[PDB]
């Protein structure tokens, strides 16, 4: 029937913005080595105002050297007394976002922590001041080295919080002159953080926002009672097809309507990680081919636009929002300056399923909606119209709708899976760049000598660490190996995921079946040290311990092994080898069909060793444990 949109009796909650997550883990990994102009174009679709997704909020992982879903991300403090604010790519990403949108909101949250913070235990709450010290340094560094103001700081992603830690974090922030930084907790469930705020006055005072993960558009009573801002601080996480776009469309509206949540943040920002890693293509768009330059501006980009391009942090929701009688919902916002945005969604059940949670079936059918602008909204002679149809027309602008009647009323015919945005704002724009190059597989012949003296990023391109951390390394005394790739962790992190017991970095095409991998390796630890190269590595990320394939190990005690698994439980071959520490060797591993061979300095070590087939996966390098080791002159030839 009719839906009243009124101002006169007051407003709803302040709108805080829409955002996305870069990190948890290494989700932006393959974006950094995109050639220009494509890399810059992708960033525009994400962050440029009145263009693409036009995001209000960017949330990033504070790397802790641990595996955090699709890879590891480097910490600013690998060891005690170590400080480096130029590792990884989150600094760069934040700067790129701020250049396009100076008003963008920045958040930081740790998934994992370096092992040395635990002081013997794998626990970040052993020394509260130390862990807070670590986190605050990251915030200080963002300002001092990159001119970044971090707006919000979290606790420990989907992990228990410590009330004394949060209080210490607040005290530490203030002590370092960061009074303006706000705290969000606890990036998990609504409980126990919500009840803890009601029971503890001192905890209530230091927490600014309650952020919950995948709330299914609902909150809980204690959260409402707190009087705190409530955010869906992580949501979405669905493959960016039309379905995922429908999911994203529905929850953007109904998170506030059903749960009073004034912000929603998607995991993840962009799918710049190998698709065969966990939750592949679960970003707002896709950019997983830096070698070709191909990127896909997926449907969720324009779903975001329907809200972001016509709302800003600081607008207020109207009291008058709700569901449509025949399915779907509507929200309305104002800036308090006479502008009005109305967002309408009619996502069907079959085309809006999220992975978390899965809604019981609900009906959606054709309907008419009549809207009447009461209060100070009674005015507004014209409204711009933007339309999207999923399943396929995206963010197309329709003809201005006029209210010269005086009734302050208008009517729409709605159908399944549609978005309408009705706004007084005239700045809307479907941004566009020419189509990027076509999809191409990872180069069947590939090499890297790691010879870069002033690298822009701390790690060689396309190498996605899945346990441990690999960096560019300059050794000035050695001439033949002055520039190498080095694994730099010397102890297991305070882990978020189940990191492997061995370090590993994967690269290439997961489809590869027959391949030849070569690399120069260097074992830094006497007697006990070990390294490997591998092919047909089929699992990574959160499942990195599950990785099977063909692994060629050599050890400083004068031995080698060939295993079917990263964990080394299953032996293909083993024996002795002329191998010691602090010496450069060239490993070659060849795999074809049922058989594999291995070479040491160009000489056959083992041949015709039967391996399981069929099987496919990436190539990789790594170390036996968390130990220093160097790699150089990497090459791979493969058949897909
Ligand atoms: C949170 O939002 C809910 C809406 O789901 C508010 O609860 C009531 O919602 C019904 C219809 O959904 C309205 O008729 C009531 O007027 C709402 N309550 C009140 C007190 O107005 C709830 O109030 C909101 N909580 C806040 C804003 O703290
Ligand atoms: C709706 O659009 C914008 C909201 O920011 C307003 O336009 C700005 O208004 C301020 C003062 O009100 C000026 O200083 C800016 O130069 C304006 N910018 C632009 C791009 O116009 C506008 O006033 C709002 N209200 C209406 C009725 O349009
Ligand atoms: C990888 O190597 C295997 C083994 O050499 C290939 O499988 C053979 O394919 C030929 C056809 O060209 C058959 O005649 C053989 O009988 C197959 N051998 C086995 C053991 O199946 C396979 O085609 C190669 N794959 C790629 C992508 O190069
Ligand atoms: C859904 O609603 C439509 C319209 O009222 C009705 O025709 C249809 O039978 C319903 N189907 C289900 C499964 O509820
Ligand atoms: O859905 C998975 C997704 N959500 C949970 C974690 O916070 C993320 O890193 C990621 O694993
Ligand atoms: Ca080199």
Numbering used by the authors: 25 to 415, 420 to 668
Paper text:
The lysosomal enzyme β-galactocerebrosidase (GALC, also known as β-galactosylceramidase; glycosyl hydrolase family 59) is essential for the normal catabolism and recycling of galactosphingolipids. GALC catalyzes the removal of the terminal galactose moiety from substrates including galactosylceramide, the principal lipid component of myelin, and psychosine, a cytotoxic metabolite. Removal of the galactosyl moieties by GALC occurs via a retaining two-step glycosidic bond hydrolysis reaction.
Of the aza/iminosugars tested, DGJ and nortropane DGN are the weakest inhibitors. Only lactam IGL and DGJ possess a functional group on the ring corresponding to C2 of the substrate and in both these structures this group is able to form additional hydrogen bonds with N181 and E258. 3 twisted-boat conformation allows DGJ to form a hydrogen bond with the nucleophile E258. 3 twisted-boat conformation is favoured by 14 kcal mol–1 over the chair conformation for DGJ. Due to the position of the nitrogen in DGJ and the orientation of DIL in the active site neither of these molecules can form direct hydrogen bonds with E182 in the active site. Our data also identifies that it is not only charge but also the position of this charge in the active site that is crucial for stabilization of GALC.
